[PDB]
Amino acid sequence: LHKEPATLIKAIDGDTVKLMYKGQPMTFRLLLVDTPEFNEKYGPEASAFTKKMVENAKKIEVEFDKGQRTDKYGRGLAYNYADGKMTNEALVRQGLAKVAYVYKGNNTHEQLLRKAEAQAKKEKLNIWS
Numbered sequence: 012l013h014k015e016p017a018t019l020i021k022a023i024d025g026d027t028v029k030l031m032y033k034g035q036p037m038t039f040r041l042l043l044v045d046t047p048e049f050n051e052k053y054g055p056e057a058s059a060f061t062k063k064m065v066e067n068a069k070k071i072e073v074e075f076d077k078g079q080r081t082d083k084y085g086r087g088l089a090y091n092y093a094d095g096k097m098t099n100e101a102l103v104r105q106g107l108a109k110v111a112y113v114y115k116g117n118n119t120h121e122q123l124l125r126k127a128e129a130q131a132k133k134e135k136l137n138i139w140s
């Protein structure tokens with residue numbers, strides 16, 4: 012896979028963000044994770060966590076996987092990086108998202124994220140508390 016540039020337009024929630032990519036505004040849905048909706052338990056904390064990670068970053072990147080690059084809603088499907096740290100993994104490692112939505116062909120970072128989830132679960136963090 013390859014990191015590509017993007018710039019933040021706006022935080023949305025724990026697993027969606029509005030970024031400018033190839034010069035066009037797009038909503039991105041983070042691959043392989045599910046954060047609680049804002050109205051759910053830990054939804055606010057997941058939103059805040061992503062918000063802070065993307066707003067503080069000097070360099071935002073997106074990395075598409077091998078399969079579908081946009082979902083049925085027109086959302087881009089990517090791994091997002093903030094100053095070289097993957098937001099998808101960071102959310103899981105902190106117990107603020109579950110590994111989820113693992114479709115064949117867009118699952119390159121599956122095992123990295125499951126390893127993170129195991130550790131968040133061991134530590135009883137957030138969702139796992």
Ligand SMILES: Cc1cn([C@H]2C[C@H](OP(=O)(O)O)[C@@H](COP(=O)(O)O)O2)c(=O)[nH]c1=O
Pocket residue numbers: 040041042043044045082083088112114117
């Ligand atoms: C993460 C992801 C979600 N989606 C679709 C599946 C779900 O369909 P439904 O809307 O029919 O439930 C929805 C979940 O996204 P959200 O968790 O943002 O709601 O997005 C994909 O198609 N591919 C993906 O890789």
Ligand SMILES: [Ca+2]
Pocket residue numbers: 026045046047048
């Ligand atoms: Ca969600």
